[model samples]
Target: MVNPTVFFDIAVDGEPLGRVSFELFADKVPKTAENFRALSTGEKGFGYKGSCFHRIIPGFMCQGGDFTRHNGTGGKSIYGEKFEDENFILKHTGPGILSMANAGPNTNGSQFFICTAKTEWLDGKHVVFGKVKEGMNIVEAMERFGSRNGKTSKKITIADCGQLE
Candidate 1:
C-alpha cells in the first residue's frame, strides 16, 4: 500500500520558491507519520498554514512545522498530548531527509527539520520520517540565505502543505 506524502510550500520575504514534497514511512513509523499528516492538515487549529521555519542550521538542516508558537519552542499534536517517539530503522542518510525535533526521546510535538546534507551523527537522535521528492534548489537557496554573512537562521512562512494545485 502507498504510505503517504506531504508538500511544504515555503516563502521568504513574500516570494514563492515552489514546494518541497516528501513520502512518509507509515509502516516503519506509523504514529509519527499519522501525527505529521494530521498536523499538516491543521486538524487541531495548527498546521502548515502560517507556520514559520524557526530553525535553520547552516549546512545542517532547516526546520519548521511548529504552527502554534511560530518558533522551535512550541508545538501541539492531533492527540492533544505529547506522544512517544515512534522511531524505526529509517536513518538520516542524506539531504532532504525529514526528521522530528524533540527536546528528548518521545517528546516530539510539531517541530521537524530537513537535512541539508549527510549527518551520520544524527542517525539515532532524530527519527527520519520522510525524504525530499522535489525542490532541493529551494532548500539550497534557504541554506545560502541562512548561512551567508553573520546571519545564523532565517524565518520562513508556510503558505500551505498537503495539497498544491
Candidate 2:
C-alpha cells in the first residue's frame, strides 16, 4: 500500500520539453489516479507521443492529450466514474495543473488540459491531479505556438511517466 509520487518527461521529436513531477493524492481520486498510474507504467504510456496541443487560448489555457491529432476526437473514450470525494478542493488556477478532460461528469478517459492562467470557471468541474514542477517555460513556449482547431500545433510527447517516490 505504498503511495508513489509521479513524474513525466515531456518532449517533442526527441527534444527535451521538460519534466513534470507530482505528489499524487491517490486517495482523493482513486480511480483516476489508478488510471494515470497504469498509463505511467504501461508500454503504451507513450501513446500520446506525436500528439499536438491542438488548442490554445491566450489568458486561458492550452489543451492536448488527443492521441489522434483530431480535435476533440482523440484518446480512449470512457465513461467518467464518480470520485469518492466529490468535494475535492483542487482547482485549475495555475500553470502545470493536471486535470481530467470530460464531456461531463464521469466521462473522463484520456484528455487533459494545462492552465496558463487562473481558470476560476473550472473551480469544481475538472479533477485537478497535479501541477507542473519544472516546465512552466515549456508550457509557455507551447502557448506561444498557439492552437489548431482548438489547441496548439506543437506536438508534445510523454517521453516517460512514472512514480516519483
Candidate 3:
C-alpha cells in the first residue's frame, strides 16, 4: 500500500499560501505520524489551525505547530505527552522537508520545522517524516517575512491539516 499524505495550508499575515503536501513515512515513523494526524485534524478541537511558525532561522529552518501558546514555548503531542524521536534516514536536505522539533534527544512533540535549505547537521536529532512536494516557495517567504524581537511577527497559519489521500 502507498503511504499516506498530510496537506498543510500555509498562511502569512492571514493571507494563504498554496499548501505543501507531505508523504508520511508510516512504515518508518508510524506512531509519530499517528500523533501528527490527530493534532492536525483537530478532530476534537485539536489541530494546528491557529498554531504559529513559532521559530525561524534563515538558512536554518522554520518551526511551529504550537497549538497551546502559538509560540515555541508550548505544544503537546496527541499522545498527551512527549514521545521518542523516530529513526528516519532522510537528511534535512533542501527546502520544505518536515521534521519534528524537540528539546533534546528523543523529545518529539506536535511542533515541527521545515528546512529552508540543505541542512545536514540536523541528520540525527529531529524526526523527518515528510517533504514539501509543492508550494515550497511559500515556505521560503515565510522565513523572510518579519519578526519582532524573539517572537515571530509574521504568522504562518495552518488553515487545515489532515490526511490528503
Candidate 4:
C-alpha cells in the first residue's frame, strides 16, 4: 500500500507561519505512522490541533504532540497511553526526518519530533516514521524559535493539522 501524507499548519505566538507536509513511512512503520495519521485526523476527539511544539532544539529537532498538556509531558496514543517502539528501519539521516518522541524505550505515544539536522546516534533508539515532503521553509522558520533549553523562544503551535487526501 502507498504511504499516506499529512500536513501541519503552523503558527508562532499565534500568528500563522505556514504549512509543512509529511510522507509517513507506512510501508515500514505502519503502526507508528497510523498513530500519527489518526491523531492528525483527530477521529479520536483529540489530536495535534492547537498543541504547541513544546520542545524545539535548533540543529536537532522540533518536538510536539502533547495535546493533553500542550507541553512535552503529556500525550495519549490511539492504542493507549503508550505503545511499543515499532522498528528502527529508518535512520535519522538528515533534516526533515520524523521520529517518535519518548521518555525511553517502548514508550511511544502521541509525541513526535522533526529533525532539523542529521542525528545518526538516534537511529536505533527512535522509530523514524516520516519526512517533510513539502514546505521545509516553514520548518526552517520554526527553527529560529528554538531555544537552547529545548523550549521555543516564542510559542510554536500546530495551528491546524490533518491527513492530506
Candidate ranking (lDDT, best to worst): 4, 1, 3, 2
Off by over 4 Å in 4: none
Model 4 clashing residue pairs (backbone): none
Candidate 1 on 62-164: residue-level lDDT in tens? Answer: 8787777776678877777877777648988889888988898778888888899998787788888888878888887876656533243445777777732
Q: lDDT tens digits, residues 1-165, model 4? A: 689999999999999999999999999999999999999989989899999998888888889999998877799999966999999989998999999988899999899999999999998999999999999999999998988898778999988999987
Error of 3 at 35 (Å): 1.7
In order, the Cα lDDT scores of the candidates are: 0.78, 0.64, 0.77, 0.92
In candidate 3 the C-alpha lDDT for residue 25 amounts to: 70
**Candidate 3 on 29-61: residue-level lDDT in tens?**
788777777777787568787677877777678
Q: What is the lDDT of residue 127 in candidate 1?
A: 86
Candidate 2, residues 1-165, lDDT tens digits: the string is 755566667776568877766555566666666666655555454435445556777666767666654476666532233233234477776766777777766666666777888777887788876666666776776677674345445555667667665
Poorest lDDT segment (10 consecutive residues) of candidate 2? 77-86
Give TM per candidate: 0.90, 0.74, 0.88, 0.97
Task: Please identify which of the two predictions, 1 or 4, would achieve the higher TM-score against the true structure.
Answer: 4
- Candidate 2 residue runs with Cα over 4 Å from true position: 1-3, 43-50, 68-70, 77-88
Worst 10-residue stretch by lDDT in candidate 1? 146-155
Residue 8, model 1, lDDT: 76
